[PDB]
Structure 1
């Protein structure tokens, strides 16, 4: 279950998540747009899903993409803040899962975000250990998809 995937996030994993988020989450606009542009660059097949955002190749200049990207970072802020209470983490994860289920995003497709996360983490010198930690948090969402 989602609870099982969440309840498994250990003290060490939570530490790495919080330490990396302190840095990446400090610039939500910059890193949020970077995450999305990287997703579109490495997984061009996902571009069609974001038709509401217009021309995503516009990057930062695209107000709709910017608004979406900043908001996405607060979804992650939400997750990070709920780490010590699995019950709260689960209910917020399920809420966001619905937002993606309605768009027909499968657990496998959601996992495509791991590549971009790893790259942005590397841009701030956070290695594989950190990418693995984030993959575990992403896996909690996947349990709900």
Structure 2
């Protein structure tokens, strides 16, 4: 359950999420687009869910993809800001899940974002310990789908 998954965010996990976000979240447009382009490159099967975005290979030059990418980063910002209060983190995660559930995005499908995040982190010199921390946060969302 989402309530049990949120309890998995231990002290050190929260600290690593914050320290890495301080860097990653500093360039929401660049890192957001990088995450999406990587998702579409490593998992082409997901492109179907984003038909409204148009030609996703244009990257930064595609206004719709750019708008979506920047916006995606503010959801992560939201999650990070709620780490201090589990009750708030949970209500924000379930709120976030509503539209993804409507789109029939499964926990397994959502988990495909882990790869892209790990690569963005690595490009900023954040290794496996950080990727694992982020996978735990993604797991809270997966529990709500």
What's the TM-score bracket when you normalise by the shorter of the two chains? over 0.9
Once superposed, which parts of structure 1, at least 4 consecutive aligned residues long, lie more than 2 Å away?
none
Provide the C-alpha distance between the structure 2 equivalents of 1:35 and 1:116, rounded to a whole number of angstroms: 5
CA deviations on 1:35-71 (whole Å, 9 max, x unpaired) are 0000000000000110011111010000000000000
Identify unmatched segments of 5+ residues in structure 1: none
Residues in 2 aligned to 1:90 and 1:68: alpha-carbon distance in whole angstroms: 23
Count matched residues. 145
1:88 aligns with 2:73: no
Describe the superposition over 1:66-122 as per-residue Cα deviations: whole angstroms up to 9, x where unpaired: 000000000000000000101100011001111111111000000000011111100
Cα distance in 2 between the residues matched to 1:3 and 1:74: 22
TM-score when normalising by structure 2: 0.99
Partner of 2:36: 36
Contact 2:8–2:136, Cα closer than 8 Å, also in 1: no
TM-score normalised by the chain length of structure 1: 0.99
- Give 3-state SS (helix, strand or coil) of 1:27's partner: helix
Structure 2 unaligned blocks of 5 or more? none
